[PDB]
Design a protein around this ligand. Sequence first.
Ligand SMILES: Nc1ncnc2c1ncn2[C@@H]1O[C@H](COP(=O)(O)OP(=O)(O)NP(=O)(O)O)[C@@H](O)[C@H]1O
Length: 210
Amino acid sequence: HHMEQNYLYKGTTTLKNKYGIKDPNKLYERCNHDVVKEAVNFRHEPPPQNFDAAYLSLIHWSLFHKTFEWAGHTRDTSFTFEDGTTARMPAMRPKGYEAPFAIGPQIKKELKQLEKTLNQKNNLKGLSHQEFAENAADVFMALEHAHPFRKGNGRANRMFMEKLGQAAGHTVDFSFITKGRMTTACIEAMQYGNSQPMKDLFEDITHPQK
Ligand SMILES: Nc1ncnc2c1ncn2[C@@H]1O[C@H](COP(=O)(O)OP(=O)(O)NP(=O)(O)O)[C@@H](O)[C@H]1O
């Protein structure tokens, strides 16, 4: 259990962070604030040639480097903090639920499989509204199950989808999507094998580019 605990301040359930904030709720507030600002900037970046694991990590670094020392690094790789301790978390399972995220070697395997799919589908270009929304839901569910980071997966994955939409000719807009709406879609897909809420979600947030 040792490696996993090194993500957290001794005795707390709070992730080590660059603010040195020990209060979990204050960390949440400060992090969110910084991520929203960095997200505004990242929306202006030109699309990458390849939508791959490296790009997801670039997104994660861009959103979270002010918050976490390990921003951009996935939880299957050992990370050594400035404080000298080393953390890793190959297995994560949402509390109170049976189905885990990708475990250990599965994280890389799943990301590689998603890379191949996107390359084969030419990054979802040349698709109608309906076709893009359908395929984008599948991509997002794959990202969500992979859950490659210790924290910040939702925000990195959602930005990945915004940028994919930008490249593909579709605006993907999460601005009116509550935490509850998103959580319900994610849980139904991953815990219960029901993709309809996620399909509906991507239909609701996908629009022609203006
Ligand atoms: N029981 C669950 N099963 C599957 N996915 C879940 C479950 N609970 C939460 N999730 C999803 O896990 C993601 C959150 O991962 P996390 O590493 O906490 O990302 P985050 O960016 O830090 N937080 P957030 O802004 O709320 O998405 C969200 O997409 C949730 O909908």
